[PDB]
Amino acid sequence: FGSLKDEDRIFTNLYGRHDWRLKGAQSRGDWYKTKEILLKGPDWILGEVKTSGLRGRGGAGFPTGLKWSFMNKPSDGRPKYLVVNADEGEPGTCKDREIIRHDPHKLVEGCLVGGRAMGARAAYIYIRGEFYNEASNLQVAIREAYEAGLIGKNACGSGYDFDVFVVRGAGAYICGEETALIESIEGKQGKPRLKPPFPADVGVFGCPTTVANVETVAVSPTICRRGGAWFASFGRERNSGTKLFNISGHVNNPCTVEEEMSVPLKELIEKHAGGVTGGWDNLLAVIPGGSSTPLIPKSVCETVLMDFDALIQAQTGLGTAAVIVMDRSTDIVKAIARLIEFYKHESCGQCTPCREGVDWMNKVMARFVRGDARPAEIDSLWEISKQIEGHTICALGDGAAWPVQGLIRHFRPELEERMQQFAQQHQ
Amino acid sequence: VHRDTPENNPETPFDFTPENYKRIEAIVKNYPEGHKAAAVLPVLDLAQRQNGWLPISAMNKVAEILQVPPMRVYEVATFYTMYNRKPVGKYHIQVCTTTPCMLRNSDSILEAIQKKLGIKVGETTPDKLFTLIEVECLGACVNAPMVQINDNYYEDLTPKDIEEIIDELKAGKIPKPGPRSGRFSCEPAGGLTSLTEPPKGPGFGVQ
C-alpha cells in the first residue's frame, strides 16, 4: 500500500465538476481517441482492464474485469443489452447522482466504449424517478451530443454504434438486485427471480443481459484510455484503485472526495475537512458500510485502512462506499432502530424467511429501545439473525441481519443496563 | 391506508388528451415487438400527470390500450410508491428520516411545521394545497435533512429558512431547488481546487 495513502491530486479519474456542464467537443478530457479503440479487435479491451481489475462498485466483490470477459464470449440468435443501475438503495450512499448532475457527457461514452466489449446491441439505463429534475436533463445531454452525430448507428467510424434508452422507476429498491431490475425493466411487479436459473446472463429480458454499475462503466473508458501501470496505483496486490467516499452524519463539511484505497479512517474522517465533533472523546462509534455493515467501536477501525479485505479482517467489510458515524447524544440503540424500521418497508415479500422474519425483529426492537421486558431475549434475538442467511433469495436478507448481528457484537452492556433502567423504574 | 376500492369512479370517466396519443407512439417505439405488452411504467404514470391522481377508471383505461387483463395493472399500481391512488394536494411534501437524516436531526425540518403549518402528519391541509409524509432513500445524505416538495428538492435546509420555503410557496413563489446555503454543489472543500487539466497528454495506451 506504500505510504499509507490515498492522496488526492488534480490527477484523478474524474475530469471536471465546476468547469463546464453543457455540451461541446469535450473541450479537453473526454471523447478524445475513439475510432482507434473500436477499430481494434474487441477482446483487446477485454482483459485490458485487468491492468486495474476493478472490484466493482455494486456493493460486492467479483471484479468487473471478469464478468464481461466472462460468458457472453459467444453469440448465437439473440441480442444482448446493457442495464446499468443509476439507482441508490443504500441510506447515505449519495455517491451516485453527483456523477450525473454536473457531468453526463462521460457515461454515454462509458456505455458506447464499454458496450463494444459486451458485443451488445442496445443500451438501457435505469434511474429512480424520485429524481425528477437532474435525471430529466440526461436526455438533453443525450441529444446535445447524440444529435451532433457522435452516436449511432455507425458513429463514429465503426459499423457498430447504438443509442441509450432512459427509463424510470417509482418506489423501487429494484436496483437492490440484478435479476430484479431486468424484471421491472419489463413491467412485471419486480419480485426478483431465483439467483441460479441460468444466472443473470442467461435468463434476461428476452435474452442475455449484464447488469453493471455506475462507476464500473464510468471509469472504464479513462482506464482504457490511459491505463498503465497507473491502473494499479494504490492499494495492495489485491484491491487496487481510487474510489469515491461520501462522508455523512458527523463532520465539519460532509462532502465527497476522491480517495485511493488503504486510507486509514482516523486521518480520512478528520480530513475533508475537519472532524468537527470531538476528534476524540466523542467516542467515535462508526459504521463502515452504509446499511450493510455493523458498528465498530473506538478500536482498530481508526487505524484500519479502508481497503476491502482489510475490513473483512474486522467483523464486517463494506462495498457500499459510504460513511456514517456518531459522537455522543445519538443513542445507538435509538439510532439503529430507524435503520431497521427501514428494512421492513423495502422488502419484496416473496420468501418466508424475509417476510414475517424481519418483523419478528422489528416488532421486538421497539421493546429494547423503549426499554421493556427482561434479558435472555438478546440471546435469542441473536439466533434469529443467525437463522436468516442461506434462507433468503436476494441479499436483502443477508443485508438484513448484519446491523443487528453486529450490534449484539461490540456492545454488550448498553442494552443490559437499559433493561435495568426500566426495571428499577417499574419498582 | 387500504388496498381495496369502494367503487369510487368505475366510470369516472377519464381520457387522454389527443396531444398525448402522439407520444405513446414513441414509448412503444422503445421496446421490441410482441413483447411490448408492458410499457406500463411510463404510460400508467403519464396518466397520473394528466390528472394528478389516477382513479380506478384510469387503471381500467390503459388496459384497453395495452390489452392486458386489468388485474395485470391494479397490481402494478399497488406495488410501487410514487403513484397516488387516493386524492392528494397541490404540494405533496417529504421529510427524509433515516439513519443519516436522523443524525443531522431531520426532526428539525420536520415538526415546527405543525406549529407553523398547523396540520398533523399524513393529513392533507383542510383545503387542498398541502399534505405531509416522510420517506427513505432518496438523493443525498451528504446534505442536511433535505426536503422534497413535488418535482424538486431543497437540499441543506434548516428550521429557519424552511419557514420561508413553505411560506414563500403559499405566496406562489418558488425558491430555487438547490442546497441554498453552504456549498452550492456539495463540494469537497479540502481539495475542491484541483486545477482541471486535459488528460495528461494522451497517446498513452496506443501500444
Partner: peptide
C-alpha cells in the same frame, strides 16, 4: 422545472430519431 410537459422530450426529437425500431415479433 417543467412539471408537466414531458412531450417534446418524449415526442419531438425522440419520436422521429428512435429508429427503426425493428424489435421483431413475438406475435405471440
Amino acid at each position: 422545472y417543467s412539471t408537466y410537459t414531458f412531450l417534446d422530450l418524449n415526442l419531438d426529437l425522440s419520436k422521429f430519431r428512435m429508429p427503426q425500431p425493428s424489435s421483431g415479433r413475438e406475435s405471440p
